[PDB]
Chain A
Amino acid sequence: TRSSRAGLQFPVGRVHRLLRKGNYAERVGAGAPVYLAAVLEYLTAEILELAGNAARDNKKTRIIPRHLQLAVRNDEELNKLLGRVTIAQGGVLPNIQSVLLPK
């Protein structure tokens, strides 16, 4: 398997298959599937890392969409990446304006 040859977890073969069966170019390079899968695996590791930390904070083992929402929105770059994306059952960050606070 080409995934084992690159030390990656995501299937390089399935990536190469989807790149050919999607009509993006006449030909598909050999290093592109390995390099596209590596970015995907890195980004999934980024989210799962912050999601597991949010899971530890909520004292729960299984990651729920609440954890994904908190993880993506607390990161400055993951928020910019998924800026036009709504996560199901995600909710919003706790935020109350200063003027609205009691005085």
Chain B
Amino acid sequence: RKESYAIYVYKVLKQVHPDTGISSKAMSIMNSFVNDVFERIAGEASRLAHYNKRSTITSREIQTAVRLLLPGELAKHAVSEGTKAVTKYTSA
């Protein structure tokens, strides 16, 4: 069994464009993009832990990592969407 974020790319696609589809090649391209951004953020946060003599990757490591990798507006909106989701998770 090979894992992927495929079924969730479909869900997000239908939430934004319900009358559109995706090909197998474009889906694998989306899979590599998700994993690439995954490794970049997780890698930068790992460095942040080592630089500050820390052994855990908390919310602050992810937040400043997204500040570093994304250029301004995408970083602004990513921090907003994430802190919104974390606050909603913290509630329940």
Smallest beta-carbon distance A80→chain B, Å:
5
Interfacial residues of chain B within 9-56, with CB under 8 A of chain A in the complex: 9, 11-13, 15-17, 19-23, 25-26, 29-30, 33-34, 36-38, 41-43, 45-46, 49, 54-56
Query: Which of A29, A39, A46, A87 has its CB near the most chain B CB atoms (within 10 A)?
Result: A39
Chain A residues proximal to chain B, CB less than 8 Å: 2, 5-12, 14-15, 18-19, 22, 24-29, 31-32, 34-49, 51-52, 55, 61-65, 67-68, 77-78, 80-82, 85, 87-89
- Complex partner residue of A42 from B11, B20, B26, B77, CB under 8 angstroms: B77
Smallest beta-carbon distance A18→chain B, Å:
7
Shortest Cβ distance from A43 into B: residue: B37
Contacting pair B38 A27 (CB below 8 A) = no
Contacting pair A31 B59 (CB below 8 A) = yes
**Binary flags per residue of B77-92, CB closer than 8 Å to A gives 1, else 0:** 1100111111011101
Total interface residues on B, using CB and 8 Å?
58
Contacting pair A77 B88 (CB below 8 A) = no
Q: Which residues does chain B contribute within 8 Å of A87, judged by CB atoms? A: 29
Extra 6 A-B pairs, beta carbons < 8 Å, given A63-B23, A67-B26: A9-B11, A24-B46, A35-B82, A41-B12, A61-B21, A65-B25
Contacting pair B78 A43 (CB below 8 A) = yes
Contacting pair A44 B34 (CB below 8 A) = yes
